[PDB]
Design a protein around this ligand. Structure first.
Ligand code: FDA
Ligand SMILES: *[C@@H]1O[C@H](CO)[C@@H](O[C@@H]2O[C@H](CO)[C@@H](O)[C@H](O)[C@H]2NC(C)=O)[C@H](O)[C@H]1NC(C)=O
Ligand code: NAG
Ligand code: NAG
Ligand code: NAG
Ligand code: NPO
Ligand code: NPO
Ligand code: MG
Ligand code: MG
Ligand code: MG
Ligand code: NA
Length: 584
């Protein structure tokens, strides 16, 4: 027996296991599908970034009805440290109203102010050098960045010169410098904080900051390369799990917990454990012959991600060096790698293909002449039109509440809906942070080795195309501003200056948008049960005792930001919630 068993050793699972094992009377077993990383350069060194080393194999979407019925490979981590081990290290909090909105959906104790102590606890910020801060326009508010917590973050110690042209261009088209994008608003441009340990300029992933750091503890146990295949119950009490080798060896083992089972298996993993365990929609469980322990139609509903668009460019006068110099100039690449190996300086401190600065914008900043028109269309349309026909009414009610919160965010000048980035080379990136579309993740069988059916339903809500087209147009403004025109950019096929109407631009976007940046969330949502929720405000699964969801399956909806910083902080908070209930 262990005190706690955690299914998934990703960001949430390892953060929780670390904090729970601070009490030597508490024992934890973390069961993780993937192996330990080997500290290979493709993980530790930003410039060597090789995320495909630990992608979960054999996951494909359904044909995407909103994206010309395209099928895409599904990307999620399978490795100790989860997404933190293979992500692009972008470390950003959401905006105040994200957390305040989660609270307003019926979740006492959720707000920006309740999260801020956990953001601070989570991390240690290391300031950049003064000369890079001054030259780069790096700013921060030290009063709201942690100085003593486990997650290291800082910045690269270098910037490609064309990042300057893009900064000035973004300013020219109404994206001003943001003092600190961690202070609960991020309207304009800023340096991307990176989850790097500045001692060695290497990745600070959860395997290091929430396992290696505390791995002398005998009460903190890890079992890599095993899958949690089922939750075990005595009546409605979660008492243990079954696990199998990830490789599918014909062996099953049962292990038991004296206090709780925690699911931390991610947006695409947690709902599958619940559904195989008979916690999920009666209709699906009945079809597969799985006994219903708790009839929760929200399990596998409400899937969200943050779609991405790569816009290709050619330049008549780009500045050298730039990120594509690493790929197209072997001499430059070898000299920057030798520079990093010697004094830990230069381009290898930046995640490969990224630049150092980024822009975020509200709907009114993206669409200053038309945002009210997009809000009017969204307010006019029935919430239920966004969901499959015959969606459970409780799930529709939760989606209606989310939608009302997001339409308030659309009117809010201080909440982001999209991002613009330029890596300094042949492509730009435009992310959609706040889709109104909702997808599904459902098991197809009782075989725990079978991939679930993953249907992002990207672009099924027509409002999303209007928001995304506005983001595309703002990106075009940056590239046509004086500071960027000096580099001689032009959109490459299948984009181009001759695509001038919304219709022309979005027909190409429909063919190129990726449903996912591997930010899958919200498939075991924290909302009232009568709003299609799966977990309470204490993250307890409805209808059963001793069972919580820790991973970002529990989020109601996506942030103005990428998920990692909040995945850590929310696990920091859940550790304290659990310790208080037991008296640990
Ligand atoms: C390639 C790539 C790139 C990015 C990102 C992800 C990825 C994959 N993200 C997203 C971010 O990393 C992600 O949202 C968080 O890691 C989510 O943390 P969780 O704890 O929810 O799941 P996470 O995915 O971290 O952990 C879930 C774990 O559960 C395991 N698991 C699944 N099913 C299991 C089962 N049945 N039994 C046992 N273990 C099981 C998995 O193997 C995995 O390690 C990101 N975010 C960000 O803010 N900045 C960024 O730069 C990026 N970029
Ligand atoms: C990563 O963050 C941790 C946590 O603050 C830092 O660990 C500290 O390291 C210093 C010097 O090595 C020690 O004197 C402290 O006692 C450690 N503090 C704690 C709270 O453990 C580590 O320094 C960070 N990395 C950087 C570059 O600052
Ligand atoms: C996608 O597939 C369905 C039938 O499988 C079809 O009716 C629909 O027209 C297709 N969508 C597009 C945009 O081609
Ligand atoms: C920093 O901002 C100043 C003032 O707007 C500008 O002149 C400069 O080019 C910027 N540099 C970078 C690297 O963004
Ligand atoms: C290639 O990189 C080297 C090393 O910085 C540089 O001197 C050279 O001019 C670059 N060549 C081209 C063609 O970019
Ligand atoms: O290669 N990558 O960094 C990726 C690829 C796909 C994805 O959805 C997220 C990140
Ligand atoms: O700047 N931001 O808020 C971001 C940055 C990256 C990302 O994937 C999502 C949001
Ligand atoms: Mg210093
Ligand atoms: Mg300045
Ligand atoms: Mg200027
Ligand atoms: Na330096």
């Amino acid at each position: 027996n262990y005190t706690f068993i955690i299914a998934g050793g990703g960001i949430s699972g390892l953060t929780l296991a670390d904090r729970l094992t601070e009490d030597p009377r508490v024992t934890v077993l973390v069961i993780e599908a993937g192996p330990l990383d080997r500290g290979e350069d493709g993980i530790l060194v930003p410039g060597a970034f090789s995320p495909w080393l630990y992608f979960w194999p054999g996951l494909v979407s359904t044909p995407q009805a909103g994206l010309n019925n395209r099928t895409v490979d599904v990307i999620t981590a399978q490795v100790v440290g989860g997404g933190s081990t293979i992500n692009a290290m972008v470390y950003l909090r959401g905006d105040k109203d994200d957390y305040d909105s989660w609270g307003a959906l019926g979740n006492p104790g959720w707000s920006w102010n309740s999260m801020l102590p956990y953001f601070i606890k989570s991390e240690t910020f290391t300031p950049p050098s003064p000369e890079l801060a001054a030259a780069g326009n790096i700013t921060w508010d030290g009063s709201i960045r942690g100085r003593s917590g486990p997650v290291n973050y800082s910045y690269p110690n270098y910037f490609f010169p064309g990042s300057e042209n893009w900064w000035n261009a973004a300013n020219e088209v109404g994206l001003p410098p943001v003092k600190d994008p961690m202070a609960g608003s991020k309207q304009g441009v800023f340096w991307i904080p990176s989850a790097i340990d500045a001692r060695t300029m290497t990745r600070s992933h959860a395997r290091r900051n929430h396992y290696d750091r505390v791995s002398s503890r005998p009460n903190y146990h890890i079992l890599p390369s095993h899958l949690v295949s089922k939750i075990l119950f005595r009546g409605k009490q979660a008492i243990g799990v079954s696990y199998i080798p990830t490789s599918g060896g014909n062996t099953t083992t049962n292990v038991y917990a004296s206090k709780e089972i925690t699911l931390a298996a991610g947006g695409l993993g947690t709902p599958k454990i619940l559904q195989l365990s008979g916690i999920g929609p009666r209709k699906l469980l009945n079809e597969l012959g799985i006994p219903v322990i708790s009839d929760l139609p929200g399990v596998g509903q409400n899937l969200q991600d943050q779609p991405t668009l790569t816009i290709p460019y050619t330049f008549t006068n780009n500045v050298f060096p730039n990120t594509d110099s690493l790929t197209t100039n072997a001499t430059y690449n070898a000299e920057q790698r030798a520079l990093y190996d010697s004094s830990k300086q230069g381009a290898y401190t930046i995640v490969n293909s990224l630049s150092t600065n980024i822009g975020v914008m509200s709907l009114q900043r993206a669409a200053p002449k038309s945002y009210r028109q997009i809000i009017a269309a969204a307010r006019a349309r029935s919430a239920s039109l966004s969901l499959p026909p015959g969606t459970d009414p409780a799930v529709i009610r939760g989606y209606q509440a989310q939608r009302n919160a997001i339409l308030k965010q659309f009117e809010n000048p201080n909440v982001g809906v999209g991002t613009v980035h330029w890596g300094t080379g042949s492509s730009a990136l435009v992310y959609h942070l706040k889709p109104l579309s909702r997808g599904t993740v459902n098991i197809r069988s009782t075989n725990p080795l079978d991939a679930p059916e993953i249907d992002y339903r990207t672009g099924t809500d027509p409002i999303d195309a209007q928001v995304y087209t506005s983001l595309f147009r703002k990106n075009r403004e940056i590239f046509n501003a004086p500071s960027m025109r000096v580099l001689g950019p032009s959109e490459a096929a299948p984009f181009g200056a001759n695509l001038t109407t919304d219709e022309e631009i979005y027909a190409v976007m429909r063919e190129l948008i990726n449903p996912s940046n591997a930010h899958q969330c919200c498939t075991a949502a924290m909302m009232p049960k009568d709003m299609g929720g799966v977990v309470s405000s204490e993250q307890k699964v409805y209808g059963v005792q001793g069972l919580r969801v820790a991973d970002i399956s529990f989020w109601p909806f996506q942030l103005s930001g990428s998920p990692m910083a909040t995945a850590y902080a929310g696990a920091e908070r859940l550790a304290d919630v659990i310790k208080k209930e037991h008296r640990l």
